[PDB]
Amino acid sequence: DAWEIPRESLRLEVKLGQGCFGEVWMGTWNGTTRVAIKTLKPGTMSPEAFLQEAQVMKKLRHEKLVQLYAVVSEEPIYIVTEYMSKGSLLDFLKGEMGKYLRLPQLVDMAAQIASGMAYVERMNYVHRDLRAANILVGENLVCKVADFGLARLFPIKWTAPEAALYGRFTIKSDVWSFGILLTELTTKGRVPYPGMVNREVLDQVERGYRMPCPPECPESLHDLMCQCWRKDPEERPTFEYLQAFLEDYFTSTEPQYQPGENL
Numbered sequence: 001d002a003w004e005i006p007r008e009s010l011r012l013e014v015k016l017g018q019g020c021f022g023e024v025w026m027g028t029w030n031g032t033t034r035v036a037i038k039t040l041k042p043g044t045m046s047p048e049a050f051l052q053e054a055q056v057m058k059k060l061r062h063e064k065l066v067q068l069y070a071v072v073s074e075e076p077i078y079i080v081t082e083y084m085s086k087g088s089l090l091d092f093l094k095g096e097m098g099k100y101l102r103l104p105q106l107v108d109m110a111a112q113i114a115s116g117m118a119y120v121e122r123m124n125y126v127h128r129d130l131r132a133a134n135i136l137v138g139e140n141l142v143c144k145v146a147d148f149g150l151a152r153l154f155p156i157k158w159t160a161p162e163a164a165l166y167g168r169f170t171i172k173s174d175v176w177s178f179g180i181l182l183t184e185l186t187t188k189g190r191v192p193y194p195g196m197v198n199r200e201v202l203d204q205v206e207r208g209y210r211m212p213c214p215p216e217c218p219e220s221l222h223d224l225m226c227q228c229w230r231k232d233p234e235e236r237p238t239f240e241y242l243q244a245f246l247e248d249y250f251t252s253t254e255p256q257y258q259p260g261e262n263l
């Protein structure tokens with residue numbers, strides 16, 4: 001197809017990530033546009049299974065979803081996407097920039113992610129792995145949804161009960177994850193359900209347990225989290241709703257908000 005590009009048109013500057021299935025490099029394309037390059041280690045993982053990740057990024061196109069630029073489908077395979085200068089949201093919240101972010105910036109970030117998922121919602125797709133580690137940050141606190149290839153038309157702590165138990169994954173399963181993602185945003189990336197192993201999380205959540213309101217986080221925002229965590233998937237709000245709620249947050253929900261020590 002038209003996504004295919006020559007190999008000499010790619011220059012891999014410095015490596016950013018290094019998994020087992022491949023690597024991620026910061027590079028240049030056509031000697032001008034800065035890009036993100038994903039490599040596949042032949043032998044370790046197989047093609048098509050590594051290319052399916054791009055088969056879906058071809059349909060999806062939204063300013064809040066990491067955009068696919070080009071590919072090299074003939075092994076050695078290379079995936080080219082837009083470059084997000086600040087890395088993963090998770091590393092961003094935990095690093096040097098974490099101490100300065102306050103609720104208005106963090107809620108704005110949640111609004112962008114929600115906007116991106118509203119697009120996924122409209123297109124009838126399921127992400128299956130929405131979490132801070134799969135969100136990328138660019139210049140001027142821009143956030144975009146991304147992943148490794150689970151988009152379909154043990155992260156138990158981020159996975160809704162009905163999905164982790166009976167494999168029932170829906171856009172409502174993602175809404176549950178967005179709720180967990182909101183706790184990651186308000187605790188500066190702390191692993192959710194602190195001091196609890198997966199087996200405790202499963203038993204507890206089914207038993208009705210839910211994380212409490214994080215310190216300095218408005219109750220109105222924690223209530224939004226709890227809606228995302230309702231046992232019945234159909235009672236959870238849509239991303240269209242969460243997008244509007246978050247964008248209008250400081251005028252319609254917390255018009256009295258006063259900055260604090262951490263939020």
Ligand SMILES: CC(C)n1nc(-c2ccc(NC(=O)Nc3cccc(C(F)(F)F)c3)cc2)c2c(N)ncnc21
Pocket residue numbers: 016017024036038053054056057060065066081082083084085087088136145146147148149150151
């Ligand atoms: C943190 C570092 C290792 N890294 N990783 C990436 C990167 C981002 C996205 C992807 N893959 C991806 O977004 N896949 C994917 C697969 C299916 C569907 C989608 C969706 F359309 F939902 F975004 C996305 C791979 C590497 C990336 C990037 N683009 N820019 C700057 N740094 C980056």
